Design a protein around this ligand. Structure first.
Ligand SMILES: *C(=O)C(CC)(CC)C(=O)Nc1cccc(CN2CCN(Cc3ccc(Br)cc3)CC2)c1
Ligand SMILES: *C(=O)C(CC)(CC)C(=O)Nc1cccc(CN2CCN(Cc3ccc(Br)cc3)CC2)c1
Lengths: 804, 804
């Protein structure tokens, strides 16, 4: 077996090869179905969605016909909703009025369609909500109880504004804009860094969905909101500063607050009264670090919240009445009556609690049914804690009076607020998970008593839509067709669903499917193709996809992988190998989806004469909690074994793989593992190429690394062995093997990780190559050019072998 | 001619090689002072105090100068430690009392020796100057009028302290340590960044050398000081804040202040009166931007200052009477009363003014004789503005009353303060310069009416000590021996001089020389070796020194260079050349000094089989102002021509030079020219290694850049052509030719320079290599290791030749 050598292109030649092969907007999303209610008309519903037609992301609509010509395929035409000459990231809507509310760059706008007014046949002019606020307004939301009232964040304080009457008013006075960030670190209604970046919670205030009518003729509106104090949180810089809770250090001091807003009969604000918790957050919510999720029950009786402890091994779903909040009062004497007056039976209600010895994965599945009984709450939740796979559970919890009393003046023990679990039925089960992250959620048909959900049941390589009864869980019907991975949303009316779908050979496609039942059985569901929303681009003419392989690992698990064979493969020749890797939690690289957009250059590597390989090691997602928990306290230690094992599987199966010329490359956690690969297994990996690597886990934030490695004090050995900067001596003492890539202005994986590794590489007397991208297509073009040229000169070409 | 290729060592072998050649390898005695013993029975005439080292702290030593020597033998002066080790970079001294003052770590200490109290025979214990000041005290100075009083700087304000009574007091209230430096950017008695970095002025206050006695039996002590406001100056951050005046942008607002301190008969402070100039600085000193130097006349009658304009083409010497300062008064009537109280005859006295079409070079030479006439002042100054070479000039200026009167209410016209010149005599002349920087200065013997000075009269490759009369200047006697470059100081008594000397073959020695006259003529001076202070290490066996060469350039100047011939030079073989370079203003690499300490590694390159070349192109110092003025407005445009001309001279003279394997390397301005070399002349230079280079003149400071390039608006093309980051597309599209080296925390040539270059190299599609030193001997050893390997792999070795 002779060694294949890649063509030794010059720098200018390689650049021209990439500019030619290089020569992709956001697919329709955030769908919403509105019924026409016109017996005489041809359409049943109108759908609204956000999409990109190099254009602005904007609102569109399409008409859903009552019947279709089944010999033909219906292409829905995209009608623009807005009359334009930046982008809309998201939008709010209110069914009873037809009111849209959205943000577009610097402005908060509104229009009306599909309400009691009716349906437009032409683009609508966006109506600016006028303001006196100097700076940018963020996170706008319609009040569900009254669509004339919006809310938004301005300079870390909550504001409200009436779109009809032009009235505007600040609700919180927690921050001053002229004051600097070091002295003033408080905020209201805003999710802080860690909750946005590690828990995917972006809003920090929640409109109460119902209005309480006052005897006078007016009404009371409410806003639950978190208030944050980041004073004791660590500060860091980059070429102004921000608050980054480094692992083992302080997270922000949190609490819940209620803004109570009084309006008269004419829609004019009578007064605003900010209210705080009757006892501090630490007392009521013992051991809780993070407010992971929050909201209200359907009728606004209780606020709810999903609460985590610091270690993220204890989760709590807690109901919170508005009666628990009392006015923020100056005078302690006037205040003391307000505390005593609140009854002792009015308590926080921990309606659900669970624990794990691995970690809690937060998700967006949580559905609360209407209250049939004052003493009970009925809801669907998802959890991995019972079986190690995420499954839907229908739960009923009794709302009994707490044994603890506030008049006694004592402090409450852990279990004082626990509610008894009356019922707890498993809706789903098996060796596969329900998806609750990144848009995946449930849709609950309350009439037919069904629940739609996305799952890995048919394969860990494909997401599919399913439906099941929640009253008597039996058969789970798959609604999406096999051979594609899907991403779906279901109409609020539960008679339609849309799927964004693709597989390895075919680019993404968006289609509408009508749902039906047989007359005899409403429980049973069938689907029928209705129309195309976005047609597939067609198979890319010069992109050759990889083959999804697998193998039975010594670890017990099956491990899946992608293999790009070298193009124009000559028999009796062995080829240089490039291992691409991410390998960290919350990500799966290997699945039946189209990879020719993001990972197009893995094809390009195959075209040059490289064997590209991707392998999802233990710790990757969509394989259950036990699979994910394999590296708890052991980040860096187990991942390369999996990668090497899968690499050796392919080597004995395919002798076109040269094991002597193996390179590895990854970004972020992939860069981390690329460095570990060169440190631990230099016998296997000739070159490592680390992009934005994590080199030292004490430099990373609380929410992420404490979940997977615990508090640093309790795991000095795990933090040591998993940090590459504290093991610089283990890198090779020969150059052209280690390449570091990093942006200067990196917000997640700071340049500190790179420069501390560099600082320790200099101590150890070890060689490295470095590239920087100080601020953009230009950087990406240069990265790919430099990367290919590096693999050529130090791995693939004939000079590569002669260099050693 | 066969090409020689260097032996391709591994990274471990090179590290080892460097470690062994380093294994065989301290501040030489400096800041000397001669104190007379005054004992007609003792064996010693003088004791000499000096700062010196032996990896030890730099500390004060003393040595005994004997009245006679054994003239056959050679006397080694033994170093007696003056201080007892603690439970020093500079020092102050009071002759009449024998008081030493110096900062050592956080503390300011004092001891007594060589005064009335006599001479110690053992080390003294340093006495701490006690303080209530929280922060570190800087720049301690003794009041020459009273040795009980010191001044120091603390949190950018001036303080004083009495070392007998322990009274401590704050004189200025200009800065608040609590306030952040965006708000608080004022300082008192401190030289700002540009004046420390580009003019070598470190102190910003000056004690008046005499005390004015009061009627009560007390006295008035005085301190002249500069007050700086840096509010309008540009700020930069480096991984704390910096006030960095970028070229074309604002320098600090400056003024002179005067602090009148009233002391009673028993040495207690009665009062402190802060005093400002009668009219603002801009009115009294029209056109002045920089306070370059300042002090007092010997009798404390006037303050003097050397004032520069922004272009640095006008130098003034002004006398500033203490009568020009009135107290600070917020009250408007009280202040207006004080202006009219000062006579109109009290005026700034511009005793000297010069101009040039090139630039003013600031120096430390300025000597004022005792005032005989109240309307005449006599002084020695040095200047290049007459002949183009720096020479000593004795001047007598007449102190007439100005024509401008403060009562008339107008503003002074630009020459109203200019004194007439009664006499101006050249003490020296010729095609060579007097040295006035980096310790070089004059010593004026006022009895014999001679001036001792250092200069380049015998050669531009050696500094020598000379003496000449200032009354009837004729014969200039060289006092130092040929075949060595010298750095000297003369005893205040003018009967001794010390020389720190070396040459190309011999490491540095420090020897003492006694001065005498023949009995018939005190004007004539002879020298005799007296004793050694520091013995030579001897020629080191490892180190082969370079040969100095010269060539007659086409530009009309002789240009000098150094040549390291390869070690074990083979017949019929051509070797790879490394051109090492600085090539910027104020520096001379090529002279008859020992280069085996700092430039040892140029010898190491010759031991590996490289030809090493150093050439002092036009712009270098020690060749007069015309030679230096070559690149006026044209930095980066002429330097490489001279380098390439000198290299071609050596090539046709020596067949062992391989002109197809030339690399270039340098730091700071040498890194700049290394980039320019690869950009302008890719034909000659294969590889360029640029260390901490200026890539953009608009990012460098005012004091340096505007001196040589003028203001950017006056020189659009020079700034474009001279800034390499503006011309990234002119770099090669072959990799392994450009290596950038930079520290991350550099505060002179900032990382900004490299990061913007990288941005434009990335945007232009050009390859580069990069190494960083995030903060130390480790950094240096890795730099050397990487630099030898980089040249091996990309210029010298066999693989390098194949790699093209
Ligand atoms: C890591 O998680 C972060 C954020 C997602 C943060 C540190 C990161 O930095 N991601 C990041 C940085 C730079 C570029 C990308 C996009 N990435 C590049 C690699 N590409 C595969 C590939 C492209 C070209 C060639 Br040649 C080989 C391989 C996938 C997309 C992400
Ligand atoms: C430039 O003037 C500055 C400040 C003095 C500011 C940018 C500077 O950075 N100087 C600087 C940086 C780093 C190292 C030095 C010391 N310098 C290195 C080169 N050396 C000669 C040499 C050593 C090794 C080899 Br291999 C070849 C040549 C002289 C000392 C200065």
């Amino acid at each position: 077996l002779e060694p294949f050598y890649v063509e030794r292109y010059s720098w200018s030649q390689l650049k021209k090869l990439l500019a030619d092969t290089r020569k992709m907007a956001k697919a329709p999303h955030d769908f919403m179905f509105v019924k026409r209610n016109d017996p005489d008309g041809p359409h049943s519903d109108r759908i609204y969605y956000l999409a990109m037609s190099n254009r602005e992301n904007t609102l569109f609509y399409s008409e859903i016909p009552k019947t279709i010509n089944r010999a033909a395929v219906l292409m829905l035409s995209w009608k623009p909703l807005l009359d334009l000459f930046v982008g809309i990231a998201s939008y709010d809507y209110h069914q009873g009025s037809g009111t849209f509310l959205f943000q577009a760059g610097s402005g908060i706008y509104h229009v009306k369609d599909g309400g009691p007014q009716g349906f437009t046949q032409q683009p609508l002019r966006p109506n600016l909500v006028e303001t006196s606020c100097p700076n940018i307004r963020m996170d706008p939301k319609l009040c569900p109880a009254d669509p004339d009232w919006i809310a938004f964040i301005h300079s870390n304080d909550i504001w409200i504004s009436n779109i009809v009457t032009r009235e505007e008013r600040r609700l919180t006075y927690v921050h001053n804009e002229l004051a600097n960030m070091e002295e003033d670190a408080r905020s209201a209604g805003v999710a802080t860094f860690v909750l946005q970046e590690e828990f995917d919670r972006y809003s920090g205030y929640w409109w109460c969905p119902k209005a309480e009518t006052t005897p006078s003729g007016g009404k009371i509106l409410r806003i639950l909101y978190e208030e944050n104090d980041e004073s004791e949180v660590e500060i860091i810089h980059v070429t102004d500063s921000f608050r980054y809770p480094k692992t083992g250090t302080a997270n922000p001091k949190v609490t819940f607050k209620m803004s109570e807003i009084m309006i008269d009969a004419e829609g004019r604000i009578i007064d605003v009264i900010d209210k705080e918790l009757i006892q501090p957050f630490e007392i009521l919510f013992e051991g809780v670090e993070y407010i992971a999720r929050a909201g209200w029950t359907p009728e606004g009786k209780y606020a709810w919240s999903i609460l985590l402890d610091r270690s993220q091994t204890r989760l709590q779903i807690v109901l919170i009445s508005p009666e628990l909040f009392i006015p923020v009062e100056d005078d302690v004497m006037e205040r003391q009556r307000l505390i005593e007056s609140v009854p002792d039976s009015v308590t926080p209600l921990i309606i659900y609690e669970e624990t794990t010895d691995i970690w809690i994965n937060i998700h967006d599945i949580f559905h609360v049914f209407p209250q049939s009984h004052e003493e009970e709450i009925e809801f669907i939740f998802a959890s991995e804690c019972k079986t190690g796979f995420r499954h839907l559970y229908k739960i009923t919890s009794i709302l009994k009076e707490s044994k603890y009393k506030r008049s006694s003046g004592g402090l409450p023990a852990p279990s004082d607020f626990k509610c008894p679990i009356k019922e707890e039925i498993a809706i789903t089960s098996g060796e596969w998970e329900v998806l609750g992250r990144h848009g995946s959620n449930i849709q609950v048909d309350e009439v037919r008593r069904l629940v739609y959900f996305e799952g890995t049941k048919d394969s860990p390589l494909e997401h599919h839509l399913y439906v099941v009864s929640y009253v008597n869980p039996g058969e789970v019907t798959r609604l999406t067709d096999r051979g594609y991975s899907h991403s779906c949303c279901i109409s609020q009316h539960c008679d339609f669903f849309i799927s964004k779908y693709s597989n390895q050979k075919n680019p993404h496609c968006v289609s509408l499917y009508k749902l039906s039942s047989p007359e005899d059985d409403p429980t049973c569901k069938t689907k029928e193709f209705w129309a195309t929303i976005l047609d597939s681009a067609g198979p890319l003419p010069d992109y050759t996809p990889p083959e999804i392989f697998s193998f039975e690992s010594t670890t017990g698990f099956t491990l899946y992988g992608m293999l790009y064979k070298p193009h124009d493969l000559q028999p009796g020749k062995k080829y240089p190998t490039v291992l691409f890797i991410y390998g960290g939690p919350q990500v799966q690289l290997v699945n039946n989806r189209f990879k020719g957009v993001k990972y197009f250059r893995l094809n390009t590597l195959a075209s040059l004469g490289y064997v590209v390989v991707v392998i999802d090691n233990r710790g990757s997602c969509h394989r259950g909690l036990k699979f994910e928990g394999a590296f708890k306290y052991k980040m860096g230690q187990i991942e390369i074994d999996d990668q090497v094992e899968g690499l050796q599987y392919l080597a004995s199966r395919y002798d076109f793989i040269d094991l002597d010329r193996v390179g590895i490359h990854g970004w972020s956690y992939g860069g981390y593992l690329s460095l570990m690969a060169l440190m631990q297994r230099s016998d296997i990996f000739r070159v490592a190429i680390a992009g934005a690597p994590v080199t030292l886990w004490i430099f990373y934030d609380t929410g992420y690394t404490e979940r997977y490695m615990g508090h640093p004090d309790q795991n000095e050995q795990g933090y040591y062995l998993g940090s590459v900067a504290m093991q610089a001596e283990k890198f090779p003492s020969e150059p052209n093997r280690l390449l570091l890539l990093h942006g200067f202005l990196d917000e997640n994986v700071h340049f500190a990780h790179t420069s501390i590794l560099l600082s320790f590489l200099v101590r150890a007397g070890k060689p490295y190559d470095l590239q920087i991208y100080p601020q953009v297509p230009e950087s990406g073009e240069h990265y790919e050019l430099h990367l290919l040229h590096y693999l050529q000169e130090n791995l693939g070409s004939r000079i590569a072998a002669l260099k050693v």
